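Bumping my old thread because nobody answered last time. Still need a sequence for this structure:
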């Protein structure tokens, strides 16, 4: 898999981008948790679950809060230029939050874009 940052351009009409984000803790970043089948992100075929979102329309999200990221993505207009970087090892830390909890005995804080 390409692990280097990738410049992705999504064209959408008047809908969401059709993916979910998790993250926003300091040092954590903003990750794709889910891609909706038939949404603009899916149809493009370029984004994946476990991608970190580094930038949207020239707004740096590498250390954004969850709310900052959600608002930047929702308000990005119809031509969305994303810098993404595939980091599945870092992504598995979100899966470990739910796993660790069900073991130490649950949903992630997640927004649909
Ligand atoms: C409150 N949620 C995080 C679940 C969705 C909106 O950001
Ligand atoms: Cl660019």
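Sorry it took so long. Here it is:
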């Amino acid at each position: 898999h390409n692990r280097e940052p990738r410049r992705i351009v999504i064209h959408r009409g008047s809908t969401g981008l059709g993916f979910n984000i998790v993250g926003g803790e300091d040092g954590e970043g903003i990750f794709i948790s889910f891609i909706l089948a038939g949404g603009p992100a899916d149809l493009s075929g370029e984004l994946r679950k476990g991608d970190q979102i580094l930038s949207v329309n020239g707004v740096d999200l590498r250390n954004a809060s969850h709310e900052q990221a959600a608002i930047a993505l929702k308000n990005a207009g119809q031509t969305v230029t994303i810098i993404a970087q595939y980091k599945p090892e870092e992504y598995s830390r979100f899966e470990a939050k739910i796993h660790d909890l069900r073991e130490q005995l649950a949903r992630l804080w997640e927004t649909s874009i």
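The first helix runs from residue 40 to 44. Let me know if any region looks off to you.
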